[PDB]
Structure formats: structure tokens, C-alpha cells
Enzyme design. Sequence first.
Site, PDB file in Angstrom:
ATOM      1  NE  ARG A  55      -4.043  -2.156   1.655  1.00  0.00           N
ATOM      2  CZ  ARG A  55      -4.694  -1.920   2.805  1.00  0.00           C
ATOM      3  NH1 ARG A  55      -4.095  -1.348   3.845  1.00  0.00           N
ATOM      4  NH2 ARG A  55      -5.971  -2.269   2.903  1.00  0.00           N
ATOM      5  CG  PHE A  60      -2.377   8.600   3.745  1.00  0.00           C
ATOM      6  CD1 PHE A  60      -3.333   9.586   4.052  1.00  0.00           C
ATOM      7  CD2 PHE A  60      -2.544   7.296   4.243  1.00  0.00           C
ATOM      8  CE1 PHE A  60      -4.438   9.269   4.861  1.00  0.00           C
ATOM      9  CE2 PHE A  60      -3.632   6.983   5.077  1.00  0.00           C
ATOM     10  CZ  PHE A  60      -4.590   7.968   5.374  1.00  0.00           C
ATOM     11  CD  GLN A  63      -0.622  -1.638   4.894  1.00  0.00           C
ATOM     12  OE1 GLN A  63      -1.417  -0.789   4.490  1.00  0.00           O
ATOM     13  NE2 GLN A  63      -1.072  -2.755   5.438  1.00  0.00           N
ATOM     14  CG  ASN A 102      -2.509  -1.894  14.691  1.00  0.00           C
ATOM     15  OD1 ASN A 102      -3.434  -1.505  13.986  1.00  0.00           O
ATOM     16  ND2 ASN A 102      -1.986  -1.116  15.619  1.00  0.00           N
ATOM     17  CG  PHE A 113       2.097   2.889   8.102  1.00  0.00           C
ATOM     18  CD1 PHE A 113       2.269   4.234   8.481  1.00  0.00           C
ATOM     19  CD2 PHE A 113       1.297   2.040   8.884  1.00  0.00           C
ATOM     20  CE1 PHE A 113       1.662   4.712   9.655  1.00  0.00           C
ATOM     21  CE2 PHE A 113       0.710   2.507  10.064  1.00  0.00           C
ATOM     22  CZ  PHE A 113       0.906   3.836  10.458  1.00  0.00           C
ATOM     23  CG  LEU A 122      -2.694   6.548  10.767  1.00  0.00           C
ATOM     24  CD1 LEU A 122      -1.649   5.834   9.914  1.00  0.00           C
ATOM     25  CD2 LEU A 122      -4.011   5.762  10.675  1.00  0.00           C
ATOM     26  CG  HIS A 126      -1.335   2.230  13.303  1.00  0.00           C
ATOM     27  ND1 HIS A 126      -1.400   0.954  12.807  1.00  0.00           N
ATOM     28  CD2 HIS A 126      -2.427   2.908  12.836  1.00  0.00           C
ATOM     29  CE1 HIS A 126      -2.502   0.862  12.045  1.00  0.00           C
ATOM     30  NE2 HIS A 126      -3.144   2.041  12.004  1.00  0.00           N
TER      31      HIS A 126
END
EC number: 5.2.1.8
Length: 165
Positions: A55, A60, A63, A102, A113, A122, A126
Amino acid sequence: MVNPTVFFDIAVDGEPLGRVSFELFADKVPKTAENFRALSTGEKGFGYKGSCFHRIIPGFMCQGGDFTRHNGTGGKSIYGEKFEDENFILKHTGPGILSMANAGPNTNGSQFFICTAKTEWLDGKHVVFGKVKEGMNIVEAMERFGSRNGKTSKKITIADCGQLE
């Protein structure tokens, strides 16, 4: 006891894009840093070596860690299938941060990521456990080969990786 450093020779479909390096915050999240260390260095006979970024979402995050699945669910810790979130001390303060992907609380394992922005949305979700040391400009190139739907415009991979302790 200091933070270990790591390297990754990033490869796009096998073409060398460049070395990248990261620091792992063992000084605050020893489990996460140590768990990851071993997966980057490959010393658990699996881990990050070859296991790609699945990803990539421009400005952003990037990942990766799909070493046993291929859909943003691969990976487990060196100690076992998931471990706890150590803490939330380290926050998603800006690009070049690194945080454990996760499945919710206490389901972190081997997905991470690279924050490619302040991923403060986030924060509280995370485990920040690293940062880019070096090759941040290669992560910026990796994003050009992302999309936003996360599925890349080119396969982004690790030819080789290890420690720079």
C-alpha cells in the site's frame, strides 16, 4: 543500549532504486524495535527481505511487510502471532516516521508503514517505532510509483537489508 539502525536496498521490480536506512526506537519500544530488527536483518529466516510494500499512498504512507500474505495481512512477530502495542509515546509527528500496521489494538506483528506525512490521524491507533534515517528521497520516489488506491504503479521491494548498528 542505543537504537539499532538498518538498511534496505530498495528495488522497483528488481531495478535498484537506492539504499534507504531507518532508526528503530528500542530506547522507547524495545519489543517493537527488536522484533523488527530481526525481520529486517532476516536472522529469523524470513521477514522484510524481499517482502515488499503493498500500500503506497502518496503523502500518506508506504505500508509493507506482506511476507506470508499479500493483501495487508502478512506478518507476525519473532516471538509469536501478534504482540501488544508497547506504548504511544512516539507519535506520527511528520513524514519519515515509521509505525506498526496492526488489525486494531494488540494485533501488531510485522507490517509497518513509513509515514510520508504527519499521519496524526493514526495517533493512538499504531505503534510508532522507527524513523527514516536516510534515503528519504528514495521513499519520495517510491511514492511516485504508488497510486493512492495503495496498489502500486510498480512493485516496490527490498533486494537486500540488514543492520547499520
